[PDB]
Each structure stands twice: as structure tokens, then as C-alpha cells.
Amino acid sequence: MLQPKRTKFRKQMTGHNRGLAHRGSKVSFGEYALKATSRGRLTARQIESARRALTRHVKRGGKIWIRVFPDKPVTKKPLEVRMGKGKGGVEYWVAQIQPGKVLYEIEGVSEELAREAFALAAAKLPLATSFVKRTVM
Amino acid sequence: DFILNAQVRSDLGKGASRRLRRNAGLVPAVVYGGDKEPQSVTLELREIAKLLENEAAFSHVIALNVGGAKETVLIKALQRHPAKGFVMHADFLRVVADHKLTAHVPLHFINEEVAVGVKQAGGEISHTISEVEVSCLPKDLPEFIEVDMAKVELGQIVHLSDLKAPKGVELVQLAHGNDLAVANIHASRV
Amino acid sequence: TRNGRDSESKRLGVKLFGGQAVKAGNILVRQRGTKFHAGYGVGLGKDHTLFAKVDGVVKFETKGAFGRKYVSIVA
RNA sequence: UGCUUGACGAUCAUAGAGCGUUGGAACCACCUGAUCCCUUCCCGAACUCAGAAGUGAAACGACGCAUCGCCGAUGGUAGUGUGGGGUCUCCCCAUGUGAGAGUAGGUCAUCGUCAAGCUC
RNA sequence: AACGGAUAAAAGGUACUCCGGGGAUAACAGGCUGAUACCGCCCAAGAGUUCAUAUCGACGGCGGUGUUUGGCACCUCGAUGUCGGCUCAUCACAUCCUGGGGCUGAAGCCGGUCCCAAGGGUAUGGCUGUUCGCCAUUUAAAGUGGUACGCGAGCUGGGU
RNA sequence: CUAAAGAGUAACGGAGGAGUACGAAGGUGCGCUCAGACCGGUCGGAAAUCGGUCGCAGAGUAUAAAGGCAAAAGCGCGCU
RNA sequence: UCGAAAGCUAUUUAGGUAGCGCCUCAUGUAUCACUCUGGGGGGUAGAGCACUGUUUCGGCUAGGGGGUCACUUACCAAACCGAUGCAAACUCCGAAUACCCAGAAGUGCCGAGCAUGGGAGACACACGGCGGGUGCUAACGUCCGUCGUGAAAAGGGAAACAACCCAGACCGCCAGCUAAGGUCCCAAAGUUGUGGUUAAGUGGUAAACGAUGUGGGAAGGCUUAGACAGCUAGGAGGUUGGCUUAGAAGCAGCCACCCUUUAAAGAAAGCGUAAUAGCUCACUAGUCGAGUCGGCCUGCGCGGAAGAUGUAACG
Numbered sequence A: 001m002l003q004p005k006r007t008k009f010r011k012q013m014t015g016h017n018r019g020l021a022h023r024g025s026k027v028s029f030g031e032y033a034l035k036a037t038s039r040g041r042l043t044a045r046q047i048e049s050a051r052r053a054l055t056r057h058v059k060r061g062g063k064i065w066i067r068v069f070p071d072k073p074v075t076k077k078p079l080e081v082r083m084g085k086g087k088g089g090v091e092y093w094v095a096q097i098q099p100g101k102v103l104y105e106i107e108g109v110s111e112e113l114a115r116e117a118f119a120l121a122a123a124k125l126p127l128a129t130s131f132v133k134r135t136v137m
Numbered sequence B: 001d002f003i004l005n006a007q008v009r010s011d012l013g014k015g016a017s018r019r020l021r022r023n024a025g026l027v028p029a030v031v032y033g034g035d036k037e038p039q040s041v042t043l044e045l046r047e048i049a050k051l052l053e054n055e056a057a058f059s060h061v062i063a064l065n066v067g068g069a070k071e072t073v074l075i076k077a078l079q080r081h082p083a084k085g086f087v088m089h090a091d092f093l094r095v096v097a098d099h100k101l102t103a104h105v106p107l108h109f110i111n112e113e114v115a116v117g118v119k120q121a122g123g124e125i126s127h128t129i130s131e132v133e134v135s136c137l138p139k140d141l142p143e144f145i146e147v148d149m150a151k152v153e154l155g156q157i158v159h160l161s162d163l164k165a166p167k168g169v170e171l172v173q174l175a176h177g178n179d180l181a182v183a184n185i186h187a188s189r190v
Numbered sequence C: 001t002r003n004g005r006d007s008e009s010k011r012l013g014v015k016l017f018g019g020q021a022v023k024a025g026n027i028l029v030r031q032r033g034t035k036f037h038a039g040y041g042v043g044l045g046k047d048h049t050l051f052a053k054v055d056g057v058v059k060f061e062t063k064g065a066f067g068r069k070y071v072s073i074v075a
Numbered sequence D: 001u002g003c004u005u006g007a008c009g010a011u012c013a014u015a016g017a018g019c020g021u022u023g024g025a026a027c028c029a030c031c032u033g034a035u036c037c038c039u040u041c042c043c044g045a046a047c048u049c050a051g052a053a054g055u056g057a058a059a060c061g062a063c064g065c066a067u068c069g070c071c072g073a074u075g076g077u078a079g080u081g082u083g084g085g086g087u088c089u090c091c092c093c094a095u096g097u098g099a100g101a102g103u104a105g106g107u108c109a110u111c112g113u114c115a116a117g118c119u120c
Numbered sequence E: 001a002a003c004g005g006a007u008a009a010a011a012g013g014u015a016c017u018c019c020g021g022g023g024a025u026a027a028c029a030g031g032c033u034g035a036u037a038c039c040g041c042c043c044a045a046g047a048g049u050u051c052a053u054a055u056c057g058a059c060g061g062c063g064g065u066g067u068u069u070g071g072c073a074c075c076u077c078g079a080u081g082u083c084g085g086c087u088c089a090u091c092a093c094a095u096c097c098u099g100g101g102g103c104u105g106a107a108g109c110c111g112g113u114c115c116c117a118a119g120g121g122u123a124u125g126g127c128u129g130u131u132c133g134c135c136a137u138u139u140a141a142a143g144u145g146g147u148a149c150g151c152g153a154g155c156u157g158g159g160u
Numbered sequence F: 001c002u003a004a005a006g007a008g009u010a011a012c013g014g015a016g017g018a019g020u021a022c023g024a025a026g027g028u029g030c031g032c033u034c035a036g037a038c039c040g041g042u043c044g045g046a047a048a049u050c051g052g053u054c055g056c057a058g059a060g061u062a063u064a065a066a067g068g069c070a071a072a073a074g075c076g077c078g079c080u
Numbered sequence G: 001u002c003g004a005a006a007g008c009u010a011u012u013u014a015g016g017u018a019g020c021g022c023c024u025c026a027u028g029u030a031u032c033a034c035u036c037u038g039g040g041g042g043g044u045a046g047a048g049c050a051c052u053g054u055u056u057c058g059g060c061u062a063g064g065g066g067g068u069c070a071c072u073u074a075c076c077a078a079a080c081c082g083a084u085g086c087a088a089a090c091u092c093c094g095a096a097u098a099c100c101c102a103g104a105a106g107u108g109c110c111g112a113g114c115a116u117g118g119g120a121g122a123c124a125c126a127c128g129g130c131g132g133g134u135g136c137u138a139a140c141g142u143c144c145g146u147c148g149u150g151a152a153a154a155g156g157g158a159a160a161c162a163a164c165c166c167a168g169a170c171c172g173c174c175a176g177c178u179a180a181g182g183u184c185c186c187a188a189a190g191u192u193g194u195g196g197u198u199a200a201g202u203g204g205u206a207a208a209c210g211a212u213g214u215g216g217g218a219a220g221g222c223u224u225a226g227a228c229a230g231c232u233a234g235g236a237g238g239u240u241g242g243c244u245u246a247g248a249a250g251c252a253g254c255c256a257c258c259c260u261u262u263a264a265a266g267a268a269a270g271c272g273u274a275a276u277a278g279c280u281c282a283c284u285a286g287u288c289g290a291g292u293c294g295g296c297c298u299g300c301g302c303g304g305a306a307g308a309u310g311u312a313a314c315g
């Protein structure tokens, strides 16, 4: 389960998610990628589930990159607790996703296999995704 | 094979360029370099997109046709839509036969299914870096550069110094001192 | 263990901007350190207050070998 | 008439760094010695004094070179004031504005006062 | 230091209570919301002798309802009676029986699951104030909810 | 920090400190420049003191953070 | 005639009060606002990685750990190099606006500004937009900033509907023009004109996801050397592949899956036997005679879609 493993601050402001992902939108490293076409949050649990679904399908051969890291801590108020009396305590970690961000990458597999494994991973994810091949410029 | 038709464009700015991509599908573009001043042009989106399916579209000199004024240019940079992926803008560098240019030439890994590591050791080719950048004269601009794996074993790493410049091209990062790892055979992912 | 404290706002910053008429003694900048430095006709206080020593108009300038922003009073 | 050297400035990297070549007539530096002035929490290393045997090695100055650094458009993109709209966590249209990054490229500074020497 | 410091000098109980007020502010019910709850779906590693989808289904994802625990404090404090029982109900369908079907890891008998279907029907006792639950014995079945957790200007008063 | 590039700006919002210290740790004149790394060197070792190169403030600034700091605002000495 | 406030600061204060803010009146006095031009500072949006943290790959390499017990590395890893992301309490950068100042035209309803004084009220705010914290980017939630409205504002529209849209009612008129919103009937005004789309009453409530619904566009593969579909016929050996197995012999389990025969048949998908198996996918021959196949971008639709008094999610 991906986590920053240490941070300067425990808790963060909620913030917003407004960009169009002009960085992280290219297929580096690999040759096929899962690219987010919509906007949202990826929790660590979702990223791991997509990783496992994707890795189990390209069994015995391939290299996979996770280009999404959940570095944003998300707090929750417990049940039967009123408003106020402090923020609340970190529950899980999310990655902010803008349209265009590359989430996963693969190489060493055929394009037909890559599309199959990315469809498996994209069904675990709460975002609209698309399959992209590496491009020259 | 590479022909591109353009029209001189005089309406500039955010609103003008958004109207180009929205109403009458066209691509803003600029031509600079050489000995002339920059020239703002427009291109058909379907025309530039079709040209870019060619793997050599970036390492080959194009013949821009700016309203009847043919001119040899290189596709220097492209701006793509981050989500949809279509081309939003294109930078054309005027190619001059006397002045050296710098371009990113795609790599062609050959002898992949004959490598020592792949068969005798059962490794994976694992393309690390494609798209070497080269500084050469326009006549020496190659369409691609072979990596000719062939004799690569389970621990070998293909560096930038192990390639062969075709005629007179110079690998720019090699000149700086960065021996980039082009590829490496490693053990199969278990 | 918890929070809920803060100190009063110090009302720092530029009090007279470029081209403003100044009298001698007028406070030009309130600052913590020397974000601005004292140029011609400008004094420096204990707390790095920039004040006018002469009458004129404020001139802001960046100059010198260190890239210090200077406050000067010109005629 | 211009150049060279030195001191002080303007400016503060397009001016810097690195590498290489060069200057000793003068200037400057290294240099000689330390009784004298003065100095070392020890040491003439530095500071200081009296000099001119030696040398441009170090430093400094000048010249060259894009290796680094620094500068850097055009176009586009992001954002954004106002008015309007939508599918309204976020966007779009009209109009005004408009980066940062990156790309093409640029840079081995420019100027002033005074003193000495030389040149013409 | 309750740091613009009421006095030099000061803690508690009230179900024995009382006054002035407040729906400016809680408890009930209503409302908004839907984290939670319940119901459904998407993907499908796997279980199922083999076989993902007869029956299930991890890791994850998307909804619906208003339905539990909650959040809020909008109505009511010049008073909107509470839990349970009794009597009498009315509606929904996410159906417990009866009716019609598809698939089945459906031989038959009996089942499992899903679709359609709301016409009618849908226990009596022991214990407990109980709703519930456990137990006994039936039944074709002993449905799940809404109705001020339906119903005290209809009864009860065991609980509170 | 929130705080929306003048100021200000709330929450039982997110984080830390104070209720001191110093007659020198103040004034002035003079002088100096850190941290760290590498190499060489008796005990000596990762790390003590010494020498050299790099280093150019990544140190220091009584104390929390922020903003500053070469005329150093950092360090030493004499006189006060 | 004018016309607020529900703010700041303090308060045994919090639903009270006090100064300031905002209203009014009077007196005095000369400023003020809008815009243009010019001069400023900034560290936000965005961006970025130069610092501080946090990422992910790869290369090179300390150092750590193995085999020696003096040499070499099974295995982790500092630094550096390159690629690659994030940040309210990061910044090498960096707007728009906003704010401060100066000069200038016109307009101020005859004044805006300021000062002094008489009289207050008010210090429970609410919603909507935008920027945020908090909450679940839940609440007609809560807390700030900022603007608009209500408060204290009627009229018209949104069915009804403080806070939304248009517009600010001195009085009268059985005059006209417009705004938002509308024009088949209720109910004033086009059953207007032109060109398309939809068949779902979608319009007139919803997601992931599913689907030969249907319109447009740009490409691609095969194709009168016969494309796709349909129909007929064929679909072989060593060999029962080494081995394993009660029996694997084409498919259960590991590995191989090569070669010839021919217009073609991979050591055989699924119904599935105790192994041969029955059917049969790839492949070909004939017939057939003109299109055919599935991907992309996109407009409008479909399913997903269950609730309680009565149709009841166009009034």
C-alpha cells in the first residue's frame, strides 16, 4: 500500500483539483500506458487493486511502472462525533488525478495483451481512462 | 512523401486560436529559425495528423507549403491535448543546408529475437531509452538508428557509446558525458 | 498538544510607494529584516524600519552586486 | 591621435567560471632582510618597516574559445478582470489581459574620471 | 495567567423546588443530508472434481432507498404525550404462501437462483414491560417496510 | 499557514514557541570568515588536534518560526 | 425628505453595554468618485524543482552482507548521472485583478470629500455567485473573504416559491414601446418561415457499465486474379510426441508442438469418453456475383431505473 512513509505534516487542507495534467501526461519508460481522461482521486487501495489486476494478467514477463503516488493524506471524522473539536485523523492516502495523467505503464508485452490488462485495471479505478501508445514528441 | 500545406495566419491570441480548433478545424503553428523572422501559419488538423502516423515524421525534413511558398522545415515541437491527445500546435524549424540542426531520431531495436540473453538466458530486452537526440547537418539527418542487440547476454547494458552514428551525426548527450543506457537484458519478471 | 494560538498581525509592508511625496521622518517600509535596503536619504531603524531623512519622492531601485532592493528619496 | 599600466567609480553574470596563449621598458606582483616603526593568543604566514639581488613561476592584466553558467524570443498553452452560458467538485463563449516551462537563438561585457609611460 | 485585572476576602446540593425567558438551544416526532445502514449493479483472481458467472465470489468500483446509527439545528419550549400491549387499520413491493415462468452442479420427490406477479392469505403458547429473541407445538405460509418508530380528545399503564 | 501577490480577516482549523537571558552576549576601533568532503599524518578509531585542495554559507546568529545577514547582523581582540 | 445595522474592539462578556464603523440633522470648509495616462510594491492563480520535504524508473558506484578466511561477489544500499511526478505551513519564477500615488476631460442633481457638533438605531443576520478552511469539495451545515439580493423592495418571470432572473412602485389614464420570460388550449402573443435530429412521450430526474438504435465525418483491411455470408466435399504419417499415468493415445498433469505429404489440415476449441472417441473451430476446392469487415471521432436516443393516501419526475 503506497504511502509517503514520512511527511512534514500529518494533515493537509482539502484543496481543489483543477488542472489539465500537462505534466505526467506522456508515456515515458514504457510503451503502452493507462491514461486518465477524467478527473478525480485515486486511493492507495484502488491503485493496489489495479496493480494486482494488471500484473496478474501479464504473468511471466513484462515491466510495469506506477506513475501515480498517493501522497495526499485524507482525514475522517468517526461516527457519532459532532462538527468541530479538531480535524480528525488520517484514514487513507489519495493521488489527485487530472485528465491526461498517465497512471500505469507496461512494456515487454504485446499491444493486444496490454489492452487486455489495462481493461482489467481500469475496472478497479473510479476514473474514465484510455489506452495510449508511446509517441514521438 | 512529406508534404504539408499551410496558410499565413494573422489573428493571434487565446480566443483566435480556440476558434481555429473549434469552428474550422485548424492547427496554429509557427515557423522560425534559419535567417528569416518567425512566421505564424495555420494547418489542417486532419492533414497534420495523417503525416504524424509516419514514424519518420520527426526525423525527416518536411516540405511546408505556406500559400504557394514551399519551404523545407523540421517538426521541432508539438503541443498535444493532455487528455484527448490531438495536436494543438506545431513548431517548424527552418532547415538550412549550412547550419547544423538538432533532432530526436527514433530508435529501431533489431535482432531482438536472436539475442543471447533472450534465448540462451531467457531474459527480456527492456528498451530503456528510445529517441536519441543528434546534432547533424540536414543531409546527414537519419530516419532512425539501429541498436543491433544481437550479442547481448543476461547482464549486459547497452549504453549510448555502443551505438553507431550512421554518417556524420553526433549524439548530443554523449558529447556532454552522459552515457545513457539505451537498453539492458535482465532476468524475466517472475 | 493541540492548536488554537496565533499572534497579532504586525501591519508590516510598504507604506509609501514609488513616486509618492515624502517629508523627513516619514516611515516608508515596515519589515522584519531588510527586504528593502536604505538608499539615499533613507534611514534604518532598530527593527529595520525604513524612514525618510529628507523630503522628496520615493524611488524604489534594485541595484548593486547583491541584487538588493533599495529605497531612496529623490527630488 | 590612440594604446598600455595603476587607482577610484558606473553597472552587477549577455559582465561569471573553465580551458588555452601572452605581458615585465614602466607599473604591479612575487622577492631580499629585519636591527628601526609595527606585528604573531607560536611563526616577518599576514600586518609593518628598509630596500632592489632575482623572476613574471604564483597572482594580476590582456586576448581567444560556447564546456558549464547566465540571458533568451515568436508562436502556443495555463491562469485571469468583466459580461454571459453549461453537463456546474469542473469548464465553455464574447471581450480585455497573459505567464512559467520549453524551443530558435545570444553572451568570453559596456562606460566614466584621474596619474604615469609610450605611440602618432 | 479567567492575563482591560467585579471584592481585601468565597465551594457545593436540589427528584422538595420556584420565577423570568428561549424552539436564539438539547430530548420525541417532522425536515435537510446520506457518512453509516439496507438493497442493487460493474470487473472477475478464485471456489465449484474439470468449468469465472448452477451456486458463490476476494481485491477494488458505481448506484438506489430513506431504512438504522449518525450529522445539522430549519418547525414546535404562551406544551406537537413516551416504549410496549390492546382495538382498528391503510399503503409499498425489495414476495413468506398460493399463481405463471427461465437457468440449474434440474433423473423423480424435494430444492437453489433469477424474472413476472400485491388478488387473497400470512400462528398459538412458556419466559421477559419488552419490540426482539430463545424455546415448545403448529401452518400452505407464520413476509419486509411506510403510515408523528400509524393508532392514549380510542383503551391500557407493565417499562420509561 | 489558513489569508484570495497592499493592510486586515473566523473556526473547539493546521503547526510551534514565550512568561526569559546578557555589565557582556551592549558601544567602538581594529582584524577574521563558516559547515562539509577528500588526501597525508603517533596513540587517533566514522568523528579530537595538524597540513593541503575543493567548498562558497548547504554554517553561525542565547532562544520557536518567519524574514534577514559581506559595511557581514557571524567570529576574535584592545579600550570602554 | 432622508435612511441603516446585524461589523471591529472590550467586557463575570456572549440575546446586555461601550468606543469606532454604518444613518440623520446643523454649521463650517474644499475635497471626493468614475475613466484615461503615468509611477509603484507584492508573491497569490498558474507554473516549477533552484531549496526543504515527498515520488518512480534506469545507469554507475561507495558502504553493508556472501563465498576465502587472503581473493571474488549471491543479496541490500549512500552519493552522483539521466529520465519522471507531487506540496497550505516548498519557491529559481510569476500574472490578471486589487491596492497606493500623481496629472487630466466630462459627468455628479447640485453635489460628491473632510471637520466639528445635536439625535440615533444597530452590534441574532439569511440566501445566491465567486475564493477558501471545516465537514464526506454531505447538509436550507459551520466559519472567513468578496459581490448581489432579502432584511427594509412592491411589479413581471421561474406552476406555487424572502434570498434566483428582469426591473426599483409619487398619483391618475379602458394610450403606446420594451425586459426577463414567452406565443396549440387552459392563458396575452407564430398550429411563423427555412434546414436538420429524435421515436425514446426521450423531451418531461441519475452513474459505473452494456448494446448490429440512429445521423454525420475521417481513415483502414479484403474485393469481378471472385471479397463477406450461406451450401456441398475434403480436413494425412511416422505417432499411441520423450516422460508421467488405473488409462493420455489430439485436448486432464511437466516439457516439445518440429518435418514431409498437398489446393490445406497447429500433436485439436467446446459438447466430452475408460484411451481409441461421435460432432467440429483454423485451412482449402466448388457454388455464389458486389460489396464486405471492425476500429476511430462525433450529434441525438436505449438499458442500467424498486416505495410506501392518488395519476403524482411537462402546472
Ligand SMILES: [Mg+2]
Pocket (backbone or CB within 6 Å): B014, B015
Ligand atoms: Mg477568454
Ligand SMILES: [Mg+2]
Pocket (backbone or CB within 6 Å): none
Ligand atoms: Mg614580505
Ligand SMILES: [Mg+2]
Pocket (backbone or CB within 6 Å): none
Ligand atoms: Mg603565467
Ligand SMILES: [Mg+2]
Pocket (backbone or CB within 6 Å): D072
Ligand atoms: Mg526561458
Ligand SMILES: [Mg+2]
Pocket (backbone or CB within 6 Å): none
Ligand atoms: Mg517565457
Ligand SMILES: [Mg+2]
Pocket (backbone or CB within 6 Å): E004
Ligand atoms: Mg479579559
Ligand SMILES: [Mg+2]
Pocket (backbone or CB within 6 Å): E015
Ligand atoms: Mg426520592
Ligand SMILES: [Mg+2]
Pocket (backbone or CB within 6 Å): none
Ligand atoms: Mg416556569
Ligand SMILES: [Mg+2]
Pocket (backbone or CB within 6 Å): E023, E073
Ligand atoms: Mg431553531
Ligand SMILES: [Mg+2]
Pocket (backbone or CB within 6 Å): none
Ligand atoms: Mg431529531
Ligand SMILES: [Mg+2]
Pocket (backbone or CB within 6 Å): E030, E075, E076
Ligand atoms: Mg414540527
Ligand SMILES: [Mg+2]
Pocket (backbone or CB within 6 Å): none
Ligand atoms: Mg398555542
Ligand SMILES: [Mg+2]
Pocket (backbone or CB within 6 Å): none
Ligand atoms: Mg417484483
Ligand SMILES: [Mg+2]
Pocket (backbone or CB within 6 Å): E118
Ligand atoms: Mg399483502
Ligand SMILES: [Mg+2]
Pocket (backbone or CB within 6 Å): none
Ligand atoms: Mg380478478
Ligand SMILES: [Mg+2]
Pocket (backbone or CB within 6 Å): none
Ligand atoms: Mg411468544
